[model samples]
Target: QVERFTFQAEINQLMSLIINTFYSNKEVFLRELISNASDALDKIRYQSLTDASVLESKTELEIKIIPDKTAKTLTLIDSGIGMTKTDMVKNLGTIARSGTKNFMEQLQSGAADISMIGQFGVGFYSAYLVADTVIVHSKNNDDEQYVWESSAGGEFTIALDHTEPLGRGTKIVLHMKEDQLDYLDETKIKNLVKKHSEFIQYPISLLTIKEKEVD
Candidate 1:
Protein backbone atom coordinates (compact mmCIF):
# COMPACT_ATOMS: atom_id res chain seq x y z
CA GLN A 1 0.00 0.00 0.00
CA VAL A 2 1.28 3.47 -0.91
CA GLU A 3 0.52 6.43 1.29
CA ARG A 4 1.04 10.12 0.70
CA PHE A 5 0.98 13.01 3.14
CA THR A 6 1.74 16.70 3.42
CA PHE A 7 4.11 18.43 5.79
CA GLN A 8 2.92 20.71 8.53
CA ALA A 9 2.58 24.40 7.69
CA GLU A 10 5.76 25.31 9.56
CA ILE A 11 7.79 22.51 8.03
CA ASN A 12 6.87 23.71 4.57
CA GLN A 13 8.29 27.13 5.36
CA LEU A 14 11.41 25.76 7.03
CA MET A 15 12.13 23.60 4.00
CA SER A 16 11.75 26.62 1.76
CA LEU A 17 14.30 28.50 3.85
CA ILE A 18 16.73 25.57 3.68
CA ILE A 19 16.46 25.15 -0.08
CA ASN A 20 16.75 28.86 -0.82
CA THR A 21 19.24 30.08 1.78
CA PHE A 22 21.35 27.15 2.98
CA TYR A 23 21.83 25.22 -0.22
CA SER A 24 25.21 26.83 -0.88
CA ASN A 25 26.95 24.76 1.78
CA LYS A 26 25.96 21.47 0.23
CA GLU A 27 28.69 19.29 1.76
CA VAL A 28 27.03 19.50 5.13
CA PHE A 29 24.17 17.42 3.73
CA LEU A 30 26.27 14.28 3.93
CA ARG A 31 27.50 15.18 7.40
CA GLU A 32 24.02 15.65 8.78
CA LEU A 33 22.76 12.42 7.17
CA ILE A 34 25.68 10.38 8.48
CA SER A 35 25.03 11.80 11.91
CA ASN A 36 21.45 10.57 11.74
CA ALA A 37 22.66 7.14 10.63
CA SER A 38 25.07 7.02 13.55
CA ASP A 39 22.26 7.83 15.91
CA ALA A 40 20.10 5.05 14.50
CA LEU A 41 22.93 2.53 14.86
CA ASP A 42 23.48 3.63 18.46
CA LYS A 43 19.81 3.20 19.29
CA ILE A 44 19.59 -0.38 17.99
CA ARG A 45 22.87 -1.35 19.64
CA TYR A 46 21.73 -0.04 22.99
CA GLN A 47 18.44 -1.90 22.71
CA SER A 48 20.23 -5.11 21.82
CA LEU A 49 22.41 -4.89 24.94
CA THR A 50 19.44 -5.42 27.26
CA ASP A 51 17.49 -7.76 24.97
CA ALA A 52 19.67 -10.07 22.90
CA SER A 53 16.74 -10.92 20.66
CA VAL A 54 16.49 -7.35 19.42
CA LEU A 55 19.47 -8.01 17.20
CA GLU A 56 18.24 -11.46 16.08
CA SER A 57 19.96 -11.70 12.67
CA LYS A 58 20.89 -8.12 11.85
CA THR A 59 23.57 -7.89 14.53
CA GLU A 60 26.26 -6.62 12.18
CA LEU A 61 26.45 -2.85 12.54
CA GLU A 62 28.17 -0.77 9.88
CA ILE A 63 27.61 2.09 7.42
CA LYS A 64 28.33 1.77 3.73
CA ILE A 65 28.67 4.60 1.16
CA ILE A 66 28.17 3.54 -2.43
CA PRO A 67 28.33 6.16 -5.19
CA ASP A 68 27.28 5.38 -8.75
CA LYS A 69 28.57 7.96 -11.18
CA THR A 70 26.67 6.54 -14.11
CA ALA A 71 23.39 7.02 -12.35
CA LYS A 72 24.51 10.14 -10.54
CA THR A 73 23.31 8.60 -7.32
CA LEU A 74 24.87 8.18 -3.88
CA THR A 75 23.57 5.62 -1.42
CA LEU A 76 24.27 5.45 2.27
CA ILE A 77 23.40 2.17 3.94
CA ASP A 78 23.43 1.32 7.61
CA SER A 79 22.56 -1.63 9.78
CA GLY A 80 20.67 0.61 12.14
CA ILE A 81 17.29 1.03 13.79
CA GLY A 82 15.16 1.06 10.67
CA MET A 83 11.78 2.79 10.65
CA THR A 84 8.45 1.02 10.34
CA LYS A 85 5.65 2.32 8.09
CA THR A 86 4.10 4.22 10.96
CA ASP A 87 7.49 5.49 12.03
CA MET A 88 8.05 6.91 8.57
CA VAL A 89 4.72 8.71 8.58
CA LYS A 90 5.23 10.08 12.05
CA ASN A 91 8.88 11.06 11.82
CA LEU A 92 8.92 12.45 8.30
CA GLY A 93 5.36 13.64 8.03
CA THR A 94 5.50 16.07 10.91
CA ILE A 95 8.04 18.38 12.49
CA ALA A 96 7.73 16.68 15.87
CA ARG A 97 11.33 17.01 17.18
CA SER A 98 12.48 19.43 14.49
CA GLY A 99 11.97 22.58 16.52
CA THR A 100 10.04 23.82 13.52
CA LYS A 101 8.79 26.99 15.16
CA ASN A 102 12.20 27.81 16.56
CA PHE A 103 14.04 27.18 13.31
CA MET A 104 11.65 29.35 11.36
CA GLU A 105 11.78 32.02 14.04
CA GLN A 106 15.57 32.03 13.91
CA LEU A 107 15.60 32.20 10.14
CA GLN A 108 13.29 35.16 10.07
CA SER A 109 15.46 36.79 12.72
CA GLY A 110 18.42 36.43 10.34
CA ALA A 111 20.13 33.81 12.50
CA ALA A 112 20.93 30.73 10.46
CA ASP A 113 23.88 28.51 9.69
CA ILE A 114 24.37 25.18 7.96
CA SER A 115 26.34 23.97 10.96
CA MET A 116 23.45 24.66 13.28
CA ILE A 117 20.81 22.66 11.42
CA GLY A 118 21.09 19.27 13.13
CA GLN A 119 20.55 20.94 16.49
CA PHE A 120 16.88 21.27 15.56
CA GLY A 121 16.60 17.64 14.30
CA VAL A 122 15.57 18.32 10.68
CA GLY A 123 18.85 17.12 9.21
CA PHE A 124 17.30 14.39 7.10
CA TYR A 125 15.88 17.01 4.78
CA SER A 126 19.39 18.20 4.06
CA ALA A 127 19.41 15.54 1.36
CA TYR A 128 17.26 17.91 -0.64
CA LEU A 129 20.03 20.45 -0.69
CA VAL A 130 21.92 18.22 -3.11
CA ALA A 131 19.41 15.88 -4.62
CA ASP A 132 16.50 16.31 -6.97
CA THR A 133 14.87 13.40 -5.15
CA VAL A 134 15.76 11.32 -2.10
CA ILE A 135 14.59 7.74 -1.63
CA VAL A 136 14.78 6.00 1.71
CA HIS A 137 14.57 2.20 1.68
CA SER A 138 14.20 1.01 5.22
CA LYS A 139 13.46 -2.32 6.92
CA ASN A 140 12.85 -3.03 10.57
CA ASN A 141 12.96 -6.37 12.27
CA ASP A 142 9.44 -5.66 13.47
CA ASP A 143 8.08 -4.48 10.10
CA GLU A 144 8.34 -5.14 6.39
CA GLN A 145 10.75 -3.31 4.07
CA TYR A 146 9.33 -0.12 2.61
CA VAL A 147 10.24 2.84 0.43
CA TRP A 148 9.83 6.49 1.35
CA GLU A 149 10.47 9.18 -1.24
CA SER A 150 10.28 12.93 -1.51
CA SER A 151 11.56 15.79 -3.58
CA ALA A 152 11.81 17.97 -0.48
CA GLY A 153 8.54 19.54 -1.34
CA GLY A 154 5.24 19.85 0.46
CA GLU A 155 4.51 16.12 0.41
CA PHE A 156 6.13 12.68 0.34
CA THR A 157 5.09 9.15 -0.62
CA ILE A 158 5.57 5.88 1.21
CA ALA A 159 5.02 2.47 -0.34
CA LEU A 160 5.62 -1.12 0.65
CA ASP A 161 8.64 -2.64 -1.10
CA HIS A 162 7.73 -6.24 -1.73
CA THR A 163 10.57 -6.91 -4.16
CA GLU A 164 13.66 -7.60 -2.07
CA PRO A 165 14.14 -7.89 1.64
CA LEU A 166 16.55 -5.52 3.31
CA GLY A 167 16.66 -7.81 6.37
CA ARG A 168 17.20 -4.76 8.62
CA GLY A 169 18.23 -1.10 8.72
CA THR A 170 17.95 1.73 6.17
CA LYS A 171 19.34 2.72 2.79
CA ILE A 172 19.19 6.31 1.52
CA VAL A 173 19.67 7.05 -2.16
CA LEU A 174 20.22 10.58 -3.37
CA HIS A 175 19.41 11.22 -7.00
CA MET A 176 21.89 14.02 -7.47
CA LYS A 177 21.44 17.16 -9.47
CA GLU A 178 23.95 17.86 -12.22
CA ASP A 179 25.65 20.52 -10.18
CA GLN A 180 26.00 18.19 -7.20
CA LEU A 181 28.00 15.60 -9.13
CA ASP A 182 31.07 16.17 -6.99
CA TYR A 183 29.50 13.97 -4.32
CA LEU A 184 30.07 10.96 -6.54
CA ASP A 185 33.82 11.24 -6.07
CA GLU A 186 35.17 8.58 -3.73
CA THR A 187 37.94 10.80 -2.39
CA LYS A 188 35.55 13.62 -1.68
CA ILE A 189 33.18 11.32 0.20
CA LYS A 190 36.05 9.75 2.16
CA ASN A 191 37.32 13.12 3.24
CA LEU A 192 33.84 14.25 4.19
CA VAL A 193 33.36 11.15 6.36
CA LYS A 194 36.68 11.68 8.09
CA LYS A 195 35.83 15.29 8.75
CA HIS A 196 32.31 14.75 10.05
CA SER A 197 31.91 11.06 11.00
CA GLU A 198 35.35 9.97 12.25
CA PHE A 199 34.12 10.07 15.83
CA ILE A 200 31.06 7.94 15.08
CA GLN A 201 31.10 4.78 17.23
CA TYR A 202 30.51 2.33 14.37
CA PRO A 203 32.66 1.38 11.41
CA ILE A 204 32.05 3.35 8.18
CA SER A 205 32.94 1.77 4.86
CA LEU A 206 33.13 3.23 1.34
CA LEU A 207 32.46 0.73 -1.43
CA THR A 208 34.94 1.42 -4.21
CA ILE A 209 35.90 -0.31 -7.42
CA LYS A 210 39.22 -0.98 -9.10
CA GLU A 211 39.55 -1.77 -12.79
CA LYS A 212 41.15 -5.06 -13.79
CA GLU A 213 43.08 -5.62 -17.03
CA VAL A 214 41.97 -8.39 -19.39
CA ASP A 215 44.16 -11.49 -18.91
Candidate 2:
Protein backbone atom coordinates (compact mmCIF):
# COMPACT_ATOMS: atom_id res chain seq x y z
CA GLN A 1 0.00 0.00 0.00
CA VAL A 2 1.19 3.51 -0.89
CA GLU A 3 0.81 6.55 1.31
CA ARG A 4 -0.93 9.82 0.49
CA PHE A 5 1.92 12.19 1.29
CA THR A 6 5.63 12.34 0.48
CA PHE A 7 7.22 10.70 -2.52
CA GLN A 8 10.40 8.69 -2.14
CA ALA A 9 13.50 10.83 -2.59
CA GLU A 10 14.25 8.97 -5.79
CA ILE A 11 10.76 9.68 -7.12
CA ASN A 12 11.46 13.34 -6.58
CA GLN A 13 14.69 12.95 -8.55
CA LEU A 14 12.89 10.94 -11.22
CA MET A 15 10.20 13.57 -11.49
CA SER A 16 12.83 16.27 -11.83
CA LEU A 17 14.55 14.29 -14.55
CA ILE A 18 11.33 13.85 -16.55
CA ILE A 19 10.13 17.43 -16.10
CA ASN A 20 13.58 18.75 -16.94
CA THR A 21 15.36 16.35 -19.26
CA PHE A 22 14.37 13.00 -20.85
CA TYR A 23 11.79 14.44 -23.26
CA SER A 24 12.57 17.42 -25.44
CA ASN A 25 9.16 17.87 -27.06
CA LYS A 26 5.89 18.70 -25.35
CA GLU A 27 3.95 16.67 -27.93
CA VAL A 28 5.60 13.39 -27.04
CA PHE A 29 3.37 12.95 -24.01
CA LEU A 30 0.40 12.66 -26.31
CA ARG A 31 2.12 9.97 -28.31
CA GLU A 32 3.23 8.03 -25.25
CA LEU A 33 -0.29 8.12 -23.79
CA ILE A 34 -1.94 7.08 -27.04
CA SER A 35 0.52 4.23 -27.36
CA ASN A 36 -0.35 3.21 -23.83
CA ALA A 37 -4.02 3.31 -24.72
CA SER A 38 -3.35 1.14 -27.72
CA ASP A 39 -1.54 -1.36 -25.56
CA ALA A 40 -4.43 -1.41 -23.10
CA LEU A 41 -6.94 -1.97 -25.89
CA ASP A 42 -4.91 -4.82 -27.28
CA LYS A 43 -4.86 -6.45 -23.87
CA ILE A 44 -8.63 -6.18 -23.54
CA ARG A 45 -9.21 -7.61 -27.01
CA TYR A 46 -7.26 -10.69 -26.02
CA GLN A 47 -9.27 -11.00 -22.82
CA SER A 48 -12.55 -10.82 -24.75
CA LEU A 49 -11.67 -13.93 -26.77
CA THR A 50 -12.32 -16.05 -23.69
CA ASP A 51 -15.08 -13.96 -22.09
CA ALA A 52 -17.60 -12.96 -24.74
CA SER A 53 -19.65 -11.05 -22.20
CA VAL A 54 -16.89 -8.43 -21.99
CA LEU A 55 -18.45 -6.81 -25.07
CA GLU A 56 -21.93 -6.61 -23.59
CA SER A 57 -21.59 -3.04 -22.32
CA LYS A 58 -18.79 -1.36 -24.27
CA THR A 59 -17.02 -1.53 -27.57
CA GLU A 60 -14.43 -4.26 -27.52
CA LEU A 61 -11.56 -1.82 -27.98
CA GLU A 62 -11.97 1.74 -29.21
CA ILE A 63 -10.32 5.06 -28.50
CA LYS A 64 -12.05 8.45 -28.42
CA ILE A 65 -10.82 11.97 -27.88
CA ILE A 66 -13.00 14.89 -26.82
CA PRO A 67 -11.65 18.41 -26.79
CA ASP A 68 -13.36 21.28 -25.01
CA LYS A 69 -12.05 24.68 -25.97
CA THR A 70 -14.26 26.51 -23.51
CA ALA A 71 -13.16 24.49 -20.51
CA LYS A 72 -9.59 23.99 -21.72
CA THR A 73 -9.98 20.26 -21.38
CA LEU A 74 -8.92 17.26 -23.45
CA THR A 75 -10.57 13.95 -22.66
CA LEU A 76 -9.06 10.63 -23.78
CA ILE A 77 -11.21 7.53 -23.45
CA ASP A 78 -10.36 3.87 -24.08
CA SER A 79 -11.99 0.51 -23.51
CA GLY A 80 -9.40 -1.57 -21.76
CA ILE A 81 -8.83 -3.81 -18.73
CA GLY A 82 -9.79 -0.89 -16.51
CA MET A 83 -8.78 -0.37 -12.86
CA THR A 84 -10.31 -0.76 -9.44
CA LYS A 85 -10.36 2.00 -6.80
CA THR A 86 -7.57 0.30 -4.87
CA ASP A 87 -5.61 -0.08 -8.07
CA MET A 88 -6.10 3.59 -8.82
CA VAL A 89 -4.85 4.72 -5.41
CA LYS A 90 -1.97 2.26 -5.27
CA ASN A 91 -0.86 2.92 -8.82
CA LEU A 92 -1.52 6.61 -9.32
CA GLY A 93 -1.39 8.27 -5.96
CA THR A 94 2.24 7.57 -5.09
CA ILE A 95 5.47 6.04 -6.23
CA ALA A 96 6.90 3.63 -3.67
CA ARG A 97 10.02 2.01 -4.98
CA SER A 98 13.28 1.61 -3.11
CA GLY A 99 14.92 0.18 -6.21
CA THR A 100 14.85 3.52 -8.01
CA LYS A 101 16.73 5.09 -5.19
CA ASN A 102 19.18 2.21 -5.17
CA PHE A 103 19.67 2.60 -8.91
CA MET A 104 20.55 6.24 -8.64
CA GLU A 105 22.67 5.64 -5.61
CA GLN A 106 24.57 3.00 -7.56
CA LEU A 107 25.22 5.60 -10.27
CA GLN A 108 26.57 7.97 -7.67
CA SER A 109 28.74 5.22 -6.12
CA GLY A 110 30.88 4.98 -9.29
CA ALA A 111 28.99 1.97 -10.70
CA ALA A 112 27.17 2.69 -13.95
CA ASP A 113 24.56 0.01 -14.53
CA ILE A 114 23.18 1.62 -17.74
CA SER A 115 20.36 -0.88 -17.30
CA MET A 116 17.78 1.91 -17.71
CA ILE A 117 15.68 0.64 -14.84
CA GLY A 118 13.96 3.31 -12.85
CA GLN A 119 10.43 4.01 -11.61
CA PHE A 120 9.40 5.72 -14.86
CA GLY A 121 6.38 3.40 -15.14
CA VAL A 122 4.66 4.11 -18.47
CA GLY A 123 4.99 7.89 -18.41
CA PHE A 124 1.68 8.24 -16.57
CA TYR A 125 2.92 11.24 -14.62
CA SER A 126 3.49 13.07 -17.89
CA ALA A 127 -0.16 14.11 -17.79
CA TYR A 128 0.91 16.81 -15.37
CA LEU A 129 3.27 18.26 -17.93
CA VAL A 130 0.35 19.58 -19.99
CA ALA A 131 -2.57 19.80 -17.61
CA ASP A 132 -3.34 21.21 -14.20
CA THR A 133 -5.88 18.60 -13.16
CA VAL A 134 -6.58 15.01 -14.21
CA ILE A 135 -9.72 12.94 -13.74
CA VAL A 136 -9.43 9.18 -14.28
CA HIS A 137 -12.40 6.81 -14.47
CA SER A 138 -11.96 3.06 -14.83
CA LYS A 139 -13.98 -0.16 -14.55
CA ASN A 140 -12.33 -3.57 -14.34
CA ASN A 141 -13.60 -7.13 -14.42
CA ASP A 142 -13.97 -7.75 -10.68
CA ASP A 143 -14.42 -4.29 -9.25
CA GLU A 144 -16.89 -1.45 -8.94
CA GLN A 145 -16.44 1.56 -11.23
CA TYR A 146 -14.45 4.40 -9.76
CA VAL A 147 -13.30 7.95 -10.36
CA TRP A 148 -9.85 8.98 -9.21
CA GLU A 149 -8.92 12.62 -9.52
CA SER A 150 -6.09 14.93 -8.58
CA SER A 151 -4.54 18.26 -9.28
CA ALA A 152 -0.78 18.33 -9.86
CA GLY A 153 -0.61 18.50 -6.11
CA GLY A 154 0.76 15.73 -3.92
CA GLU A 155 -2.62 14.22 -3.09
CA PHE A 156 -5.56 12.63 -4.89
CA THR A 157 -9.15 11.57 -4.22
CA ILE A 158 -10.94 8.31 -5.06
CA ALA A 159 -14.71 7.78 -5.10
CA LEU A 160 -17.37 5.40 -6.32
CA ASP A 161 -18.49 6.50 -9.77
CA HIS A 162 -22.06 7.82 -9.74
CA THR A 163 -22.14 8.54 -13.46
CA GLU A 164 -20.42 6.06 -15.73
CA PRO A 165 -20.34 6.96 -19.42
CA LEU A 166 -17.64 4.44 -20.30
CA GLY A 167 -18.73 0.86 -19.84
CA ARG A 168 -15.52 -1.06 -19.29
CA GLY A 169 -12.47 1.04 -19.82
CA THR A 170 -10.52 4.05 -18.65
CA LYS A 171 -11.23 7.72 -19.31
CA ILE A 172 -8.58 10.34 -18.62
CA VAL A 173 -9.63 13.97 -18.82
CA LEU A 174 -6.96 16.63 -18.64
CA HIS A 175 -7.69 20.22 -17.72
CA MET A 176 -5.31 22.08 -19.96
CA LYS A 177 -3.06 24.92 -19.04
CA GLU A 178 -3.78 28.49 -20.10
CA ASP A 179 -0.85 28.49 -22.49
CA GLN A 180 -1.46 25.01 -23.90
CA LEU A 181 -4.58 25.71 -25.92
CA ASP A 182 -3.18 24.47 -29.23
CA TYR A 183 -3.75 20.89 -28.02
CA LEU A 184 -7.48 21.51 -28.41
CA ASP A 185 -7.20 21.91 -32.20
CA GLU A 186 -8.56 18.99 -34.23
CA THR A 187 -5.86 19.09 -36.88
CA LYS A 188 -3.14 19.03 -34.27
CA ILE A 189 -4.71 16.04 -32.59
CA LYS A 190 -5.31 14.15 -35.82
CA ASN A 191 -1.77 14.67 -36.99
CA LEU A 192 -0.33 13.51 -33.70
CA VAL A 193 -2.50 10.40 -33.66
CA LYS A 194 -1.56 9.58 -37.23
CA LYS A 195 2.11 10.06 -36.59
CA HIS A 196 2.34 8.11 -33.35
CA SER A 197 -0.67 5.82 -33.31
CA GLU A 198 -1.22 4.98 -36.96
CA PHE A 199 -0.58 1.32 -36.29
CA ILE A 200 -2.73 1.16 -33.19
CA GLN A 201 -4.94 -1.95 -33.16
CA TYR A 202 -8.04 0.06 -32.21
CA PRO A 203 -9.88 2.87 -33.94
CA ILE A 204 -8.86 6.33 -32.83
CA SER A 205 -11.48 9.07 -33.30
CA LEU A 206 -12.06 12.68 -32.42
CA LEU A 207 -15.49 14.00 -31.42
CA THR A 208 -16.09 17.22 -33.33
CA ILE A 209 -18.99 19.63 -33.10
CA LYS A 210 -18.82 21.55 -36.32
CA GLU A 211 -21.93 23.17 -37.77
CA LYS A 212 -23.88 20.92 -40.10
CA GLU A 213 -24.35 21.85 -43.76
CA VAL A 214 -27.72 23.53 -44.38
CA ASP A 215 -29.00 21.64 -47.41
TM, every model:
0.92, 0.78
Worst 10 residues of 2 by lDDT: 113-122
CA lDDT of 28 in candidate 2? Answer: 66
User: What lDDT would each prediction earn against the true structure?
Assistant: 0.83, 0.70
Model 1 lDDT per residue over 1-215, tens place: 77888988876776777677744678888898899999889989989889978887587899998988888899999989899998888777677754666776886467776557688777887787888888999988788898998886798899998755667899999999898898888788778878988789899988765457899
**Ten contiguous residues minimizing lDDT sum, candidate 1:** 92-101
lDDT of 2 at 47: 77
Please give the RMSD to the true structure for each candidate, in Å.
2.0, 4.8
